[PDB]
Amino acid sequence: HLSDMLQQLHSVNASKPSERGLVRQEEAEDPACIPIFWVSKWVDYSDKYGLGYQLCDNSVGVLFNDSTRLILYNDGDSLQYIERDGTESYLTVSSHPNSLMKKITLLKYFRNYMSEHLLKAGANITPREGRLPYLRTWFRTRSAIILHLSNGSVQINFFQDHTKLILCPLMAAVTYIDEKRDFRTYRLSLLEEYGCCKELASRLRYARTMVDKLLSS
């Protein structure tokens, strides 16, 4: 759906959202389109293992350096192992699967690390109701970290001001978290009619540049 997202993002950037006479941004809000999932926190151990992160529902997952991923559901015991080729597998920790003990151990170490050292992004936001997605890929730039989920969502966490973007092409929407940590969701199509502000417009512009990168990989 990365291709569908380049469409929507262009249309709105192509309409000069903030280059309007009167900007009626609040009119573009769509409470129903609130995301189901988004990355709460993350730790970069790619130097030796991979990248750990937590989803807003408290589940945790990791993308290992060997291109395999492991997810631990919020029940604290259910798992989901995805091999490189995308081959999903559903298991249980308590089932004590020898082949995965080392990676389970590492997954819990990230969980413990994020649990005592990091804040939970979007803590003051109730997601709408919905399987669990996994991190497909990710990368950082001098100015932000981009996270691409298996459900098609793309998240961009900006370093400087801590502002965040959560884009979804199924709902064709975007949720913008500002520096006050205010949390809002707009329907791309509407932001094209009613317009939006200057800082939201440039961020969406940066997002198209990030989606381009995601497609060229």
Partner: peptide
Amino acid sequence: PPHST
């Protein structure tokens, strides 16, 4: 290592 906020 590098991490989120």
